[PDB]
Amino acid sequence: TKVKYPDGFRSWYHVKSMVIQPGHPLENPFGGIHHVYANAEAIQGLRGGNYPDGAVLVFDLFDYQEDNHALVEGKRKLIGVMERDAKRFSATGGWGYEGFGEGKPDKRLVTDGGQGCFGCHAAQKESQYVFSRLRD
Amino acid sequence: ETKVKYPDGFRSWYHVKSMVIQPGHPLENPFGGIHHVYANAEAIQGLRGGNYPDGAVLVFDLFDYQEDNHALVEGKRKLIGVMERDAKRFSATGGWGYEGFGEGKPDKRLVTDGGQGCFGCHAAQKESQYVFSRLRD
Numbered sequence: 321t322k323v324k325y326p327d328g329f330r331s332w333y334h335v336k337s338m339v340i341q342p343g344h345p346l347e348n349p350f351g352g353i354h355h356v357y358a359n360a361e362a363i364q365g366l367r368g369g370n371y372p373d374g375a376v377l378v379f380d381l382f383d384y385q386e387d388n389h390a391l392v393e394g395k396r397k398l399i400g401v402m403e404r405d406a407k408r409f410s411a412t413g414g415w416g417y418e419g420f421g422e423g424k425p426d427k428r429l430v431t432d433g434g435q436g437c438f439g440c441h442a443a444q445k446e447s448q449y450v451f452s453r454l455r456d
Numbered sequence: 457e458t459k460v461k462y463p464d465g466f467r468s469w470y471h472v473k474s475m476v477i478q479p480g481h482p483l484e485n486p487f488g489g490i491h492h493v494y495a496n497a498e499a500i501q502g503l504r505g506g507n508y509p510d511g512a513v514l515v516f517d518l519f520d521y522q523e524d525n526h527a528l529v530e531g532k533r534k535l536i537g538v539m540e541r542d543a544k545r546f547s548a549t550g551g552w553g554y555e556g557f558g559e560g561k562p563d564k565r566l567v568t569d570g571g572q573g574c575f576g577c578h579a580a581q582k583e584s585q586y587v588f589s590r591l592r593d
């Protein structure tokens with residue numbers, strides 16, 4: 321009952337992006353430029369359906385360099401993953417939560433079953449624990 | 457065959473990279489905001505270091521942003537910029553056709569000069585076939 325590394329996530333649908341700058345409540349550890357990616361099953365839930373088992377959402381976080389008032393993507397810091405499985409991850413609302421340092425499969429960041437990730441996402445119970453909304 | 461096609465479905469293509477251009481940057485007018493670059497399959501072959509087939513398309517998707525408590529949040533789409541590869545049809549501008557679509561709407565074509573203005577800046581990147589964006593992980 322470990323969350324699987326989402327191989328190939330960079331080929332998935334780009335949901336949205338956001339920049340979190342120093343001073344933001346989530347700066348540690350989510351400071352930087354992040355991109356949200358969704359597999360096919362996750363798109364189904366984002367469009368108004370139920371999230372099927374097998375849905376995966378990825379929070380892809382980069383550092384940025386500020387250069388003459390442009391923010392430029394630097395190195396990947398981590399990915400956060402949410403993997404849908406109603407049965408296996410019922411303790412955390414049907415989603416398994418994991419982080420991978422530098423986006424590497426052997427650098428697992430979560431040490432508490434995903435409880436700390438879940439505690440913040442629980443605020444989005446009404447939208448099946450997902451913050452991100454589909455835009456055009 | 458003289459016009460760049462609107463790239464229907466580009467939001468489902470591969471996300472190459474992003475960048476933010478803030479006030480004070482030389483390109484804030486007209487490329488200020490958060491932009492994302494997308495590539496179709498044919499464009500990927502070219503970005504990977506292979507050659508660009510005719511039919512390759514690269515999309516520059518530009519959003520305004522809002523400042524919200526040390527976050528930059530995506531606002532309204534300002535425009536999309538499109539490069540469509542056709543070595544024969546678009547030979548006057550280096551084998552790419554250039555178009556801009558206001559607010560990303562198919563009916564709001566922006567380019568009036570056959571893409572010469574667009575090409576004039578892209579011409580500096582001759583050695584990478586007029587493409588600035590690089591693949592990252």
Ligand code: HEC
Nearest residue numbers: 338377378379400401402417418419436437440450451452
């Ligand atoms: C609040 C204090 C949070 C904690 C702790 C965690 N996350 Fe979260 N997450 C948060 C917000 C406000 C957002 C939206 C970001 C945006 O661009 O709008 C997210 C997003 C995710 C995503 C993308 C899917 C979604 O819900 O929007 C993933 C995959 C994600 N978060 C995973 C994740 C993991 C693995 C966490 C513990 C290591 C975790 N999050 C904690 C807010 C908060």
Ligand code: HEC
Nearest residue numbers: 475493514515516537538539554555556574577587588589
């Ligand atoms: C310099 C003054 C430019 C003019 C005028 C135009 N473009 Fe360009 N473009 C420029 C840069 C520096 C970049 C890279 C942005 C990044 O994130 O690295 C781009 C990129 C594009 C792309 C993406 C493909 C690529 O070459 O990286 C497209 C599709 C694109 N630009 C199209 C485009 C059009 C249609 C233009 C005239 C309306 C145009 N550009 C002008 C720099 C400059």
Ligand SMILES: [Zn+2]
Nearest residue numbers: 343344525526
């Ligand atoms: Zn402050």
Ligand SMILES: [Zn+2]
Nearest residue numbers: 386388389478
């Ligand atoms: Zn600045």
